[PDB]
Design a protein around this nucleic acid. Structure first.
Ligand SMILES: Nc1nc2c(ncn2[C@@H]2O[C@H](COP(=O)(O)OP(=O)(O)CP(=O)(O)O)[C@@H](O)[C@H]2O)c(=O)[nH]1
Ligand SMILES: *C(=O)[C@@H](N)Cc1ccccc1
Lengths: 61, 85, 205, 82, 392
RNA sequence: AAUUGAAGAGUUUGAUCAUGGCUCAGAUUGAACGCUGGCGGCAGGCCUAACACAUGCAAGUCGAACGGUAACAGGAAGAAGCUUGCUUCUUUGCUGACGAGUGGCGGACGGGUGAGUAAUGUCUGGGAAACUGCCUGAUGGAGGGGGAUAACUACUGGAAACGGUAGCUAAUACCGCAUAACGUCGCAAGACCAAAGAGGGGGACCUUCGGGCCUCUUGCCAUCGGAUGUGCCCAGAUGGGAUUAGCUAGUAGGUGGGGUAACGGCUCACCUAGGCGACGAUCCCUAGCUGGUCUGAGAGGAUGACCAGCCACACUGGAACUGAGACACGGUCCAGACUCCUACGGGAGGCAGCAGUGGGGAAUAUUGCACAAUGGGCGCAAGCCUGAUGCAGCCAUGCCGCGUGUAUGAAGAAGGCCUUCGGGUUGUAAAGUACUUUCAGCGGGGAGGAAGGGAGUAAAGUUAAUACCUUUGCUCAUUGACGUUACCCGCAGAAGAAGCACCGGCUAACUCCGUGCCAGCAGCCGCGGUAAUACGGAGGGUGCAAGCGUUAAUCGGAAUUACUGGGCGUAAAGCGCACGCAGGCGGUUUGUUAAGUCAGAUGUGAAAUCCCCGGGCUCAACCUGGGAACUGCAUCUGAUACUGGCAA
RNA sequence: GCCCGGAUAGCUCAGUCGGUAGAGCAGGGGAUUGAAAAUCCCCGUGUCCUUGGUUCGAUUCCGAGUCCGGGCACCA
């Protein structure tokens, strides 16, 4: 199982994602994170800070 | 496989039948002496040894035998018959 | 590679007069020195042990305009060379080409001199060199390529060098824009107010 | 068959040949018995570019080490008379 | 790879269009057999074209078949397409290459609701020329039956922006023509003669920036992604890097090979039906409907000005009026995208047969042209026919 | 000249000191991911499916071995038209050359991958029972004949693949005979054993007018060497498991026969009954090994991708042949699996060669150019072949350098944010002004890698010879994939080139607004409950920079495996106690030995890399010279205090 | 290119052969509290995936698109 970081994910039943290492320490049983911005698990919506992680592109404007 | 040097097959495969023919007549003359040893023929084997001495030596010169095998025959086979002689 | 940012803001956080904007206006004066490195630069800094070393390293790098990866390589070299670790570091950082051009007076600021080096203008031993990371060997001479000689920037800047220290280990002819390098740089002859004692210890951890 | 040939070391566009004695049935840089000198082709006019330890070469030539053309011409570059 | 192609003869993007059970597949085998005596030899049979094992029992063109032939005049390429409703999209995207085409009319069939829109699609897809062959000639003893229906046929061309009255109309039987009957065989020989005539030499745009409509991609053994379709604009040489631009996440691809019906072509030009090898591109990062554009030549658009005609219920199209929010599929020569209808103030209810003006925000980007001919289709029948006004 | 080299912090507690884990601060990678992205240089580029593979190419070559000429171009006999020597054309192997074929050499190297293997391997040092094509030295030989065969014809099986039968002819193909020695056998006497000729030039002679003859080049054959490569034996070393403790029956040794190039249970017949094993055998699991790489103060720990040596496999399992050399990547034969063609009778096939394809997968390149250089192959040579190699393309993957401009400039503006609405801050920052043009972009020039070889000539050798042939000069035309080169020059305009993380402490750096145990952050402590520097956004700052961060992975820290360098009364930990085999250690005097020990030297420790001192790429990375070093091992000569040995 | 199933308030599903959409589990908003458990007072919060048609009226009848999953094709 993996924790889904971010604010407003768009997953569903199948939805192919990507995993990276790292536990969350507060959810007993979780040892992995999902990569927002990788495969079918798209990036977080409208973040202007720390967008290397969470996969949000630079602002068009 | 289709290679220009596929001749090396037919060049050697034909050379095999030529090589096996000579290596066979070699070993028949070797077993010719041992039959005399199995009969105790001290002089018949001597002639039989004198019969194949050039036979074991000519094959040694034709690239077939590395002459040491040819030597060990002339070595032990004589040592076989002169021991009884 | 070059910082290309506010060249007087650096003097505020460091709190040291580094001559980044030496030029025409001798004393900067338009920086509100020591009390405005940023917005909340009115506070008093305690500046811990890790803080004093890291500020000591950023003091030297901001002077010579050398970035970390390139600077770490000099510390790498300063270790293997004979003598004194922190002093061999200043032996390397002083023998830099653009550093010599600043010392020879060709260029008001250090960055300006780097541009004279960068644009095939500065020439050493009759061999045009563009790399500012060039290492000046002993018994060498430095000049300017004739196509770029005395064209409104080298002249005014050379006059300004006479309003400063005029270091020991080198001396220019200054009539034909002709420099001359002598014996290796000495720890006493240089700055002597910036310290490398805390720098050697920074890479130690 | 032993042979005295170059080895081609150095870098891209900047070759540096190692005149060395090795076995003919090896690579261009394979197992070699002993190296005897070097030859820098692009050391045109500077301090030093070529050395051939001619005595140890003579030890192998006596054995029958076949010298390659490029190496053979360079023995005539380091002439006994020039 | 097989015989590096020679740039010898002029070419016309020809093909076959019509309606189910007219004989388009069988007659196309006869055309290549009639021309087998003329120059070289094709004679690509009924099984050669309905290649799929399902396509022999199903007997229809559920997936198009392209075979080339060559007259002793110039070079051509024949595109067989269906005339059936549910499989009409195979024909729709395949329709766009046809500068000139062939329409098939059996004597016991005549005009159909599909036959009616196949013609409508033509000019809206970019096919302003159509040769008509009244096939199944040996079906009645009434030669005049062929004569009165042809009156409706020329009028079918007439009603949908085509001066179809001057189109050569030869009458033959392709069943007997392919079986070897020399009597019926000469008819198609006379129709091919009209193609080295009447419908002229096309104005090829090979002197423009490169553009190529994606007909379909293949997965060739040992080669990979072979995007197929004749070049729309300019010339392309093997080694000219471009970017595959359209509906999905566009990216640069280097054209590392092009061939024509497995005939090696070095530097392709606009118009020849050739396949294009794409360097390092998966059979996932590709789609039917996108287009191969020169490096950053045209960025696709969503919102655009549009001038659209809603077909009358009498013309077999949309049979009732509608509300703002209607969702049909917009076809931009190879495109299959559902457009969001946004009709401005002045009109809200558009009845069947209305000359109206409105704009559409598209679900995704696509290669837009300010004058892009396009037919508006809803599943079942052609509901619309218009053109793009301007990119917004 | 040649190790100048070592830092800690958070967290149990009301608080402290301990012990003791957990975590961070650094470096590094064959990396992937997100955002982003100007250039150049140099390296690297399928670690997962040793999974299956389309097409091209990756090994050929010699007419100076020979029979031939099916082609191509000259030539010759002739023929043909007409411009009767202008063209046309059948013959003609007569020359240059060259398919197909015999034959020689190469195909066992190079190139690729790491499945297997815990010893049949590797590293290291020795040893003796070995062979070694091509290269090279010396001594001798190098006579005389014969019978077949492919190519080629005729017929013919078969879809194809592949052939089948009878005649034809050669050879440096094959085979006897002669001849043999420092060769083999044998104590010896004796016995026995080999072969190939070609091409060039030629005065005189000699011509059955093919040639013999003179002479040079080169090859053939034998023995002894050397050099090199390989094979073999022995000692030490060479993963984790004892919850694997006993194992083995050609198994341990002997005798005799056979076998290999070489000794030997390597193989057999019989006999003896051992051998290995707690200083870890058998069995299990994992793994290519090493020089080295990364880290480390060092000792070590992990690891061994690139590069180089060795080993091993070549679709799977197995075998042998030819050959100097293989139990053979682009060889043979068998079987199996998987593919393809088929006329269904039967065949073809092997990318772990470079490219490339599908799939696997977090993930890794072009179906490029050239034999110009280096090397390999054959050949007298010229050359021909070479996906070796040399370069180019692709990717920021890494490392190094450079650039995105310089100086000046106070309405100390605007707009933003804070505010004690006083003001501060952004900030010399921007604009404005004067300058510069690196790299890109466009327009011109321009090194080095190229040495040779060929042609011709000259001279020196050789010889009968001013010829041939070998060597040393000279002259001419030149031989470059890279290459629209490196570099240089010139033109233009501030012109095309700054992001990314973090800001509670650890750890460098701040406030306000919005959200109120929600949303969310997190490497540990932990923040969030209506006034959050820890959430999200804004301004500001800090770090690093064409990279910045995240994840994984090794070392460090970690003296938390303590050899260097820790502990055991209560923190984890003294067998419940005793006797005692193996094993470890041993009081004191003397002698003698010199194995452990030390000193010296020798042999060796491959090169590269690490380190020291220099040279060359404008600099660096990088390349490279010499040296040191390789901490080791073996032998030899001494010392012999200390330990061990034998004796008193 | 094609053929089927899921696309029903947060989640899971019942409801149709036209008749003005539900349930369960959810979670939640107010009174006390430092804040909550607990107790009291009250609760559907829905584009039935989207869009359109056969009409007095469509979750439902018939289509078409997209997305998700699962099967076959086609091979310059
Ligand atoms: N009497 C007659 N029968 C004919 C003639 N031509 C074809 N037929 C038959 O008509 C049938 C339809 O063949 P087909 O070629 O699939 O038609 P199509 O027009 O391609 C149909 P789709 O619209 O799906 O592509 C076959 O049975 C064919 O043999 C003709 O000239 N005369
Ligand atoms: C291959 O034949 C292409 N050159 C032509 C083509 C074939 C099929 C579909 C579309 C184009």
């Amino acid at each position: 199982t993996s924790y889904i970081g971010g604010e407003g994910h768009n997953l569903q039943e199948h939805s192919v994602i990507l995993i990276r290492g790292g536990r969350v320490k507060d959810l007993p049983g979780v040892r992995y994170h999902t990569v927002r911005g990788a495969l079918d698990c798209s990036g977080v919506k409208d973040r202007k800070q720390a967008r290397s992680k969470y996969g949000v592109k630079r602002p068009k404007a | 496989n289709i290679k220009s040097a596929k001749k090396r097959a037919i060049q050697s495969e034909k050379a095999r039948k030529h090589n096996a023919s000579r290596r066979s007549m070699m070993r028949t003359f070797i077993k010719k002496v041992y039959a005399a040893i199995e009969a105790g023929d001290k002089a018949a084997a001597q002639k039989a040894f004198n019969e194949m001495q050039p036979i074991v030596d000519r094959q040694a010169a034709k690239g077939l035998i590395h002459k040491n095998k040819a030597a060990r025959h002339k070595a032990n086979l004589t040592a076989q018959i002169n021991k009884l002689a | 590679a070059r910082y290309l940012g506010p060249k007087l803001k650096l003097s505020r956080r460091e709190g040291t007069d580094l001559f980044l904007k030496s030029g025409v206006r001798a004393i900067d004066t338009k920086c509100k020195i020591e009390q405005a490195p940023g917005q909340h630069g009115a506070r008093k800094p305690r500046l811990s042990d890790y803080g004093v070393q890291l500020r000591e390293k950023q003091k030297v790098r901001r002077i010579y305009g050398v970035l970390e990866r390139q600077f770490r390589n000099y510390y790498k070299e300063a270790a293997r060379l004979k003598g004194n670790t922190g002093e061999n570091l200043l032996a390397l950082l002083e023998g830099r080409l653009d550093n010599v051009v600043y010392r020879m007076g060709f260029g008001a600021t250090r960055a300006e001199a780097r541009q004279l080096v960068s644009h095939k203008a500065i020439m050493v031993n009759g061999r045009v060199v563009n790399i500012a990371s060039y290492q000046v060997s002993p018994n060498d001479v430095v000049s300017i390529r004739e196509k770029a000689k005395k064209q409104s920037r080298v002249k005014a800047a050379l006059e300004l060098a006479e309003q400063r220290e005029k270091p020991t280990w080198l001396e220019v002819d200054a009539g034909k824009m002709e420099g001359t390098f002598k014996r290796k740089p000495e720890r006493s002859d240089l700055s002597a107010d910036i310290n490398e004692h805390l720098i050697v210890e920074l890479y130690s951890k | 068959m032993v042979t005295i040939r170059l080895a081609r070391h150095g870098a891209k566009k900047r070759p540096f040949y190692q005149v060395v004695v090795a076995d003919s049935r090896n690579a261009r840089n394979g197992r070699f018995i002993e190296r005897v000198g070097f030859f820098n082709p692009i050391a045109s006019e500077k301090e030093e570019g070529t050395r051939l330890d001619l005595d140890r070469i003579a030890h192998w030539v006596g054995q029958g080490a076949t010298i390659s053309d490029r190496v053979a011409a360079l023995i005539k570059e380091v002439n006994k008379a020039a | 790879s097989k015989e590096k192609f020679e740039r010898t003869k002029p070419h016309v993007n020809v093909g076959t269009i019509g309606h189910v059970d007219h004989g388009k597949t069988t007659l196309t085998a006869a055309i290549t057999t009639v021309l087998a005596k003329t120059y070289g030899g094709a004679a690509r049979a009924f099984d050669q074209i309905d290649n799929a094992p399902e396509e022999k029992a199903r007997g229809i063109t559920i997936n198009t078949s392209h075979v080339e032939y060559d007259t002793p005049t110039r070079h051509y390429a024949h595109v067989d397409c269906p005339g059936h409703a549910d499989y009409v999209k195979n024909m729709i995207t395949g329709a766009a290459q046809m500068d000139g085409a062939i329409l098939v009319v059996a004597a016991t069939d005549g005009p159909m609701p599909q036959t009616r829109e196949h013609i409508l699609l033509g000019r809206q897809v970019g096919v302003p020329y159509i040769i008509v062959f009244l096939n199944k000639c040996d079906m009645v003893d009434d030669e005049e039956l062929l004569e009165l229906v042809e009156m409706e046929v020329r009028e079918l061309l007439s009603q949908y922006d085509f001066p179809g009255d001057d189109t050569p109309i030869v009458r033959g039987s392709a069943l007997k023509a392919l079986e070897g009957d020399a009597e019926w065989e000469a008819k198609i020989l006379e129709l091919a003669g009209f193609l080295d005539s009447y419908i002229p030499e096309p104005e090829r745009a090979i002197d423009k920036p490169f553009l190529l409509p994606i007909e379909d991609v293949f997965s060739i053994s040992g080669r990979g992604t072979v995007v197929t379709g004749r070049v729309e604009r300019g010339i392309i040489k093997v080694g000219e890097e471009v970017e595959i631009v359209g509906i999905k996440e566009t990216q640069k691809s280097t054209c590392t090979g092009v061939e024509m019906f497995r005939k090696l072509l070095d530097e392709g030009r606009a118009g020849e039906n050739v396949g294009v090898l794409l360097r390092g591109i998966k059979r996932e990062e590709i789609e039917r409907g996108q287009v191969l554009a020169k490096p950053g030549t045209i960025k696709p658009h969503t919102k655009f000005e549009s001038e659209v005609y809603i077909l009358s219920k009498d013309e077999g199209g949309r049979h009732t009026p509608f509300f703002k929010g209607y969702r049909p599929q917009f076809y931009f020569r190879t495109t299959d995208v559902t457009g969001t209808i946004e009709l401005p103030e002045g009109v809200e209810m558009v009845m069947p047969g209305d000359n109206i003006k409105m704009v559409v925000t598209l679900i995704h980007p696509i290669a837009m042209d300010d004058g892009l001919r396009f037919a508006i289709r809803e599943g079942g029948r052609t509901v619309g026919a218009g053109v793009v006004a301007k990119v917004l």
